[PDB]
Amino acid sequence: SGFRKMAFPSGKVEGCMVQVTCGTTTLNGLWLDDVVYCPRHVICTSEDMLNPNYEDLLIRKSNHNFLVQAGNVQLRVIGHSMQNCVLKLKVDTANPKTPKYKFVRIQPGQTFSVLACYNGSPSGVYQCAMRPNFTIKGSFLNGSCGSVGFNIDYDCVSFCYMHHMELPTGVHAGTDLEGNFYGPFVDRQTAQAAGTDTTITVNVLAWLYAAVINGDRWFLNRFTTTLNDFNLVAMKYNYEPLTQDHVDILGPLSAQTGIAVLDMCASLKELLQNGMNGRTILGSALLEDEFTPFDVVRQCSGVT
Amino acid sequence: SGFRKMAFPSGKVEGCMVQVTCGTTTLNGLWLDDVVYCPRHVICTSEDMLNPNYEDLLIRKSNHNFLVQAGNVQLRVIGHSMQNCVLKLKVDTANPKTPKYKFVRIQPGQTFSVLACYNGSPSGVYQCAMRPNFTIKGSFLNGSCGSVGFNIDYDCVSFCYMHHMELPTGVHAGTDLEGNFYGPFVDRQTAQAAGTDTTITVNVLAWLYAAVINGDRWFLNRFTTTLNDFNLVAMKYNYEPLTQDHVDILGPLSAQTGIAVLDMCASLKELLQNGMNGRTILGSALLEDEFTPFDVVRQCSGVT
Ligand SMILES: Cc1ccncc1NC(=O)Cc1cc(Cl)cc(O[C@@H]2CC(=O)N2)c1
Numbered sequence: 058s059g060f061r062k063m064a065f066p067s068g069k070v071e072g073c074m075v076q077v078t079c080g081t082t083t084l085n086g087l088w089l090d091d092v093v094y095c096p097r098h099v100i101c102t103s104e105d106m107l108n109p110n111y112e113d114l115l116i117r118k119s120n121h122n123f124l125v126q127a128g129n130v131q132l133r134v135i136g137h138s139m140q141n142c143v144l145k146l147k148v149d150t151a152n153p154k155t156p157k158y159k160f161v162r163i164q165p166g167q168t169f170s171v172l173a174c175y176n177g178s179p180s181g182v183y184q185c186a187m188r189p190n191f192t193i194k195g196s197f198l199n200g201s202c203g204s205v206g207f208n209i210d211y212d213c214v215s216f217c218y219m220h221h222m223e224l225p226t227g228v229h230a231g232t233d234l235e236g237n238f239y240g241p242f243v244d245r246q247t248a249q250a251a252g253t254d255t256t257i258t259v260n261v262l263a264w265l266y267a268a269v270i271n272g273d274r275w276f277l278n279r280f281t282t283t284l285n286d287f288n289l290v291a292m293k294y295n296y297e298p299l300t301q302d303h304v305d306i307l308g309p310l311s312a313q314t315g316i317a318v319l320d321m322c323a324s325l326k327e328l329l330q331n332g333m334n335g336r337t338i339l340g341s342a343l344l345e346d347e348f349t350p351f352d353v354v355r356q357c358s359g360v361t
Numbered sequence: 362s363g364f365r366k367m368a369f370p371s372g373k374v375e376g377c378m379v380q381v382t383c384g385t386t387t388l389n390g391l392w393l394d395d396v397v398y399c400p401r402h403v404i405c406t407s408e409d410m411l412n413p414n415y416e417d418l419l420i421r422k423s424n425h426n427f428l429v430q431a432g433n434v435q436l437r438v439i440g441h442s443m444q445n446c447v448l449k450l451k452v453d454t455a456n457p458k459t460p461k462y463k464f465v466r467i468q469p470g471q472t473f474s475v476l477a478c479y480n481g482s483p484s485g486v487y488q489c490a491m492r493p494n495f496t497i498k499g500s501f502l503n504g505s506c507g508s509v510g511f512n513i514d515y516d517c518v519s520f521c522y523m524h525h526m527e528l529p530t531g532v533h534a535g536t537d538l539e540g541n542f543y544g545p546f547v548d549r550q551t552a553q554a555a556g557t558d559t560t561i562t563v564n565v566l567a568w569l570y571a572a573v574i575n576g577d578r579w580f581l582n583r584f585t586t587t588l589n590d591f592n593l594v595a596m597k598y599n600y601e602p603l604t605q606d607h608v609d610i611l612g613p614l615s616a617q618t619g620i621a622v623l624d625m626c627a628s629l630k631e632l633l634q635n636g637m638n639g640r641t642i643l644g645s646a647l648l649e650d651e652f653t654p655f656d657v658v659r660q661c662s663g664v665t
């Protein structure tokens with residue numbers, strides 16, 4: 058029993074973190090096989106960030122200008138290329154610590170662990186969700202660019218995020234490992250605003266199932282609702298519309314607790330309309346939406 | 362910017378997790394040098410847990426009855442001894458992955474990362490605090506016994522916790538790596554209750570400093586207070602009495618924000634007396650007490 062915002066063990070990812078320096082700028086790179094991936098804004102000076110032409114900027118750069126350092130050893134760069142917003146630095150040595158890996162583009166609402174790094178050194182690990190507005194509410198400072206987001210399936214690490222920038226709102230934006238930004242963000246120091254961030258309804262419900270499994274049942278009521286009636290309430294509170302696919306994904310949790318999804322929706326409806334009344338759920342005074350139904354099942358069953 | 366319940370990177374600890382089996386029971390062990398540490402209740406059957414005499418139970422056990430497995434390889438046990446509530450199984454092979462390590466007994470209010478494990482395999486990592494009542498609000502299931510709590514100082518891992526049991530209240534209890542339980546708990550399946558759990562005032566204040574550093578300043582008021590006046594309020598709300606040592610430890614955070622500790626105490630006083638009024642602080646609707654002043658400084662500065 059107990060329910061925590063749990064991250065994946067970070068060891069397989071620590072063994073991939075490297076430091077990439079280009080002139081004055083130092084950020085993190087991800088070393089898998091003989092390639093180091095990092096944000097392409099490593100080649101920019103503070104003046105270049107206002108309106109960078111990365112193709113022109115990369116032309117004034119050669120393999121020897123990219124300093125890659127893994128621990129205390131220098132990696133020799135034999136190739137460089139830009140793929141969307143990431144630079145791929147081909148090095149002469151394959152990472153002996155490269156785990157089984159995949160590059161995946163995650164969906165909004167899905168979760169992942171972040172290994173925050175500075176100077177190619179991991180400082181901490183936390184669990185995040187890709188927000189419906191394609192931002193992440195992370196914890197990153199200057200130097201954290203190149204820090205990655207990932208998931209682990211037994212021995213396979215799926216890299217899903219690379220940190221590039223913080224918006225003036227304090228939320229974070231970045232790319233998949235192919236350099237494509239999540240959301241409308243561009244790697245340029247210009248006013249960029251994150252759209253309306255909605256609450257991931259299927260995740261809140263999964264967390265309400267986690268609460269029931271862990272003894273917190275005060276919010277369970279004698280009511281039920283329908284998908285349409287619940288969604289009228291969800292829209293009012295800027296919650297993602299619940300679909301039959303979401304009801305389906307909640308299925309295993311509904312089967313374990315014996316509480317129909319629409320019955321849980323009715324509890325959520327009353328919690329939205331009436332608030333918590335000073336009460337808590339899993340030690341939280343607000344509705345948590347950063348646990349997918351998969352995270353709940355795996356934490357509440359014990360998947361290693 | 363951004364503030365998350367961040368855990369230490371777990372790689373150095375994953376390289377130490379092993380599986381210890383004794384008859385029917387399987388739990389986790391910690392392999393450092395040629396010694397595997399695990400909870401001594403691994404030798405108990407379900408009938409033994411009601412009133413175990415570990416000295417007598419250990420006498421019916423020989424080195425060959427303790428199955429230690431690191432990954433897919435079996436470790437040969439050449440010695441066994443009980444040190445308080447932990448068994449130390451001397452193996453013939455030193456862990457080639459043993460990091461620089463220390464065994465420390467942490468103080469209540471201090472934080473640490475937990476690497477939850479099952480069958481010697483890490484499943485997740487989260488940040489915890491040793492509660493003033495010496496319990497931890499963790500996330501552990503059956504098989505998680507032997508999972509450890511730790512801190513990292515650059516390259517040195519300080520092991521501070523080994524998970525042993527869950528209380529009927531859903532909170533967790535365990536020992537330091539010398540087998541001494543934190544709190545009055547005994548490793549016996551008998552009704553054990555955790556005393557009153559108070560809020561770690563110095564940690565809430567440190568988190569209020571983290572909030573100010575990250576833009577959340579709504580709670581800052583035009584008032585001040587004294588240590589004695591604040592502590593009258595803290596006692597009412599089951600908060601730890603704030604001492605001059607706590608004021609001292611808050612010093613670097615007070616210097617960064619330019620907000621005197623007693624001014625922050627006055628904001629906390631009003632938040633305790635009036636609540637949040639539907640507002641949030643660092644995305645939380647309640648006062649968070651699981652970040653020490655050290656955690657705040659290190660997260661808000663970027664210590665790797
Ligand atoms: C300092 C820090 C803290 C946490 N995480 C990241 C950083 N770094 C940056 O954000 C630097 C940067 C890189 C790019 Cl590619 C674009 C930038 O401008 C965006 C546009 C907008 O809004 N801000 C800024």
Ligand SMILES: Cc1ccncc1NC(=O)Cc1cc(Cl)cc(O[C@@H]2CC(=O)N2)c1
Binds near residue numbers: 504529
């Ligand atoms: C099942 C599980 C889930 C999470 N973490 C741990 C466990 N395991 C246990 O708790 C087994 C156990 C070991 C001991 Cl040494 C004493 C025990 O009785 C205490 C006394 C009281 O209260 N409960 C029970």
